[PDB]
Design a protein around this ligand. Structure first.
Ligand code: HIS
Ligand code: HIS
Ligand code: HIS
Ligand code: HIS
Lengths: 144, 144, 144, 144
């Protein structure tokens, strides 16, 4: 293992109309909880990016139901739910030449949970640990 | 007003490297809290989609700092943080021909907060109220 | 349905060094020509949007090779390859409130060929016929 | 920098009925020709990616009209308009581990012209020179 590196599902949603409901139905039937998701969409289709409670079980269920799914490495962090808090993290990263390809995040009461897909995963984790950023274990992320 | 309809900022992040840190710095300086965000990215640029604590103040600060920003109507909902919970909502919508253009969401302890951009905003809100889905007031969404 | 409407292939490229090559090798092995293509991408993977010489045959060959492939209706038009030619077409559409979701075009010597995916195909086609834009037959788009 | 590399305009289209028309009218009013274009879109707005006859002049005119416009390096190539021609180019790149972020191409009678944005321009150009692919000078891409 790699510890703080989490598996994100990327799921190709064809049609529009449709398939997103069936995907959430596949996952419900397996008692797989969704922790975090974000759709990256275009005019015709979406891609569901997804943090789930059991990514390997979820992946095989989806393939079995004929979905196109890929797994991507991402890292979860927690910071205070106050103005400028995320700003401080991103400034640590950018000062070290580590850039965000995408991220998604919500405030959760007093903190905020952030999923990141960094330009360089080894370097990103290095900086964050160095700057004493709360990283989430992949397993913490899967049980939000 | 329109009540449950919230303002989402969409912010054009040029470069890659960069500009996301400056945007979060603009917002920090105004003591504007981020509630929820999601980047919809391509190979060159991103678009930061953003739920903030004061969208009008945030919008004018960003324009003042020469960002390209647009506001979009979205609706926030809350459901249980259990398997199939989101599934039930989406099935209500799709049974009524209301489809999701995009959404993003995180589990927040015992519930989950979901931001939706529906195919039809008037119809989406109608179905959800009818099916007794917890909608979030726009103001609830801005203070997560 | 509509007259003139052509089948665009949308192929999930699961990424980023062929998979894409593999698509093009599957089509070449079938003696299927690419007339036009463009990739709509995010940070992790792309969607190849393609006009090909036989879309049903390409579909089958790509499905046989386990690609996720969808079909989308699009419309081909021609206009003079001169400044202002395309602008003149776009103004017909935008004055009748016809939105463009996406399009792709290249100058081809004396004409430009443009593939359009409008928000409403019915209204799009009506306005183009009415304003006498040169619509392509699907089979003319396929033989480029 | 590299030899052969051309300037692609990436224009924020803030949406979805011109704004796009307005871009094309700004360029036509400057007597600037579009050689190639494609829109990379999401549900709310698009990004127009364009090759034009004078990219610095188009940039200035679009900035003068308050568009958010960025410049990206891309590379133009030609290949025979026959099945397998493009596949042959893509296999050179993918065998040397060169990833394609996006590309767009149309068959132009006897050749196809392809605009490529690779993940690493240096390595891309090296492999194309070496394997003798027909690279376009920027000024040849601009005069299509
Ligand atoms: N509310 C915090 C943390 C946050 C980021 N995203 C969501 N919440 C901020 O403004 O940085
Ligand atoms: N955990 C819940 C709700 C949820 C949706 N997105 C994030 N959480 C489910 O599986 O539906
Ligand atoms: N070159 C023509 C038409 C065109 C659009 N795209 C490619 N060509 C113009 O500038 O209007
Ligand atoms: N038509 C050629 C080259 C091409 C790519 N795109 C447009 N044309 C092929 O099938 O390889």
């Amino acid at each position: 293992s790699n510890a703080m590196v989490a598996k994100q599902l990327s799921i190709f949603l064809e049609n529009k109309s449709g398939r997103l409901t069936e995907v959430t139905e596949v996952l419900a039937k397996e008692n797989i909880n969704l922790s975090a998701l974000c759709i990256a969409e275009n005019a015709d289709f979406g891609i569901l990016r997804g943090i789930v409670s059991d990514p390997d079980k979820a992946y095989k269920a989806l393939k079995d139901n004929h979905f196109a799914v890929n797994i991507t490495d991402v890292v979860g962090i927690s910071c205070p739910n106050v103005p400028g808090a995320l700003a401080k993290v991103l400034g640590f990263l950018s000062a070290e030449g580590v850039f965000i390809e995408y991220m998604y995040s919500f405030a959760n009461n007093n903190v905020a949970n952030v999923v990141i897909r960094p330009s360089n995963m080894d370097k990103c984790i290095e900086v964050l640990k160095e700057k004493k950023v709360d990283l989430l274990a992949a397993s913490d992320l899967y049980k939000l």
